[PDB]
């Protein structure tokens, strides 16, 4: 029947939620399903939703809550930043392992809690990564110090041998401007779904 087709179809596939698109609180993982178009479909304003989406939007990705509202507008936000964070994490290549002595959940009524990682990493911890220069022991990643350090779409705890005064005290609260290199030690994941990275400042 039609009903069966509807149940199958791509709008039914997007699991509904009425969480805020603007959430100024702490964001530990994606809230909403990111939805992309193709360039062609964007050109004729079609996203595979109830209505056309405004020609002002030139980004291919978005997030939404309601197909149509009482205000006669779809409730959306044109941004898909969460995919890029995931891709950055993948690039960094630091495999998430549970610091607590437990089996990997992907191997072997309902539990709504996050099964291992939320699916930002299905990488396994045992691999090395060779290159022309050699086998990479230390993962080199550029990040920004805030005061904690922003390292490729994630905030991370930082440690060092000696606190460098020349770089820090010259610009005390404009440290965000200057990008510093980092050596990421390991990535643990807590119950709330926050990725607790740990980096080391290189100079």
């Amino acid at each position: 029947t039609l009903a069966e087709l509807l149940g199958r179809s791509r709008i039914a596939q997007v699991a509904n939620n009425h969480k805020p698109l603007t959430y100024t609180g702490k964001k530990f993982h994606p809230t909403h399903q990111i939805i992309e178009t193709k360039p062609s479909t964007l050109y004729r304003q079609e996203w595979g939703l109830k209505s056309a989406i405004p020609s002002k939007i030139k980004s291919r990705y978005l997030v939404y809550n309601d197909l149509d509202t009482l205000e006669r507008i779809t409730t959306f936000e044109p941004r898909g930043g969460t995919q890029w964070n995931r891709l950055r994490f993948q690039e960094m290549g630091v495999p998430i392992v549970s610091n607590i002595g437990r089996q990997n959940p992907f191997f072997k009524k309902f539990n709504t809690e996050i099964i291992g990682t939320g699916g930002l990493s299905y990488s396994l911890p045992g691999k090395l990564k060779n290159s022309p220069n050699g086998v990479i022991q230390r993962t080199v990643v550029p990040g920004r110090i805030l005061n904690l350090a922003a390292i490729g779409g994630f905030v991370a705890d930082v440690v060092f041998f000696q606190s460098p005064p020349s770089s820090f005290n010259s610009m005390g609260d404009f440290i965000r401007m200057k990008t510093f290199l980092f050596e990421i030690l390991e990535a643990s994941m807590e119950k709330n779904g926050s990725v607790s990275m740990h980096a080391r400042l290189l100079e």
Binding site: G81, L146, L148, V155, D173, F174, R176, S194, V195
Partner: peptide, 22 residues
């Protein structure tokens, strides 16, 4: 040096975005 009102301190476990610095 600068005041606290004009600089968003991103928490430790959180994700951020380029916009989030603005």
């Amino acid at each position: 040096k600068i005041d606290q009102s004009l600089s968003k301190k991103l928490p430790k476990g959180t994700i951020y975005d380029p916009f989030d610095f603005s």
